[PDB]
Symmetry: C3
Subunit: 133 residues, 3 copies
């Protein structure tokens, strides 16, 4: 159909970087842009168009059941394939991400009004704290 | 007026790059920052101020009529001047962006609840898919 | 507690950079990513989890009283420490940021429905305009 009216949210983006490089867009702009998603609003009246495009941060969703392994594609980071398995150790939620990187996984737990997250890959550990809203 | 209360949205930004260089901000941080807009919330009571600043992604508008050539400044990408012409090929919306780059243009079409966009410059082709919201 | 339900806003992040490096995340992405905060939404029923994580731009806050010098940590830009003093010159709000950078400060004023901001560091001046929302 020719009727392009609506709000449209990006779901896939292939070779955005090669296209941007052809436009001589700088190295830093290319790498940051290729991770963003976009929203296009198209306002169309016959053959007349008013278009609006805006970058947005991608939402990165993951669903799982404790004790049931699942395939995870780490699009929020390095976009690798891992086989992820989440277990309870007491009240600590523990995830092992089996794949190319050794000793990769995370631990997540609630203490008080705070969520604690420890991210591990190899010999590097990232430690994060979140406040409840 | 001394009364600065309100929410303020950026509409122009001159020499942000030179100011950031003087502050010795790294090339990469500068290229991400220079393209964003800002919102300032000012909460003022007499001479007491609570100020809030937040970066936001810029919205890029383009208006055209099918079959009517128009001057396009590709602000969302490489900020070049092109002579753009949009035509229908059946239900495919086709754009030729005549200018410094050879074989530059795009194709856009609706199939089902999805919008398809193909961006071309020279021998580089980027393919994007959007879902209706 | 095992009950991780809620919306969680990041408040601290330690060695995110080392973790991203271990994942082979590119230099540019690492530099822009460290400046972001994130919100995690957790929808949990027993051992079933639906998790959503989204990056967002940080809010940068400043509180001050006209005529009272204060310590300012310029996190939104170069992350320097300055001694800031804000004064009125007529209806123009004037700030001197005393510190490592010479001739550093800003001037801010309302004219009509617009906020004007002049940012100065050394011999570089950035000029910004905001419209009221």
């Amino acid at each position: 159909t020719r009727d392009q009216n609506g709000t449209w949210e990006m779901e896939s983006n292939e070779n955005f970087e090669g296209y941007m490089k052809a436009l001589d867009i700088d190295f830093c702009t290319r790498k940051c842009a290729v991770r963003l998603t976009q929203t296009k609003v198209i306002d169309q009246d016959g053959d007349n168009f008013k278009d609006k495009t805006t970058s947005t941060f991608r939402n990165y969703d993951v669903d799982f059941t404790v004790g049931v392994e699942f395939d995870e594609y780490t699009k929020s980071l390095d976009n690798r394939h891992v086989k992820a398995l989440v277990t309870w150790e007491g009240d600590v939620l523990v995830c092992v991400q089996k794949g190319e990187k050794e000793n990769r996984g995370w631990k997540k737990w609630i203490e008080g009004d705070k969520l604690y997250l420890e991210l591990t890959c190899g010999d590097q550990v990232c430690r994060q704290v979140f406040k409840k809203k």
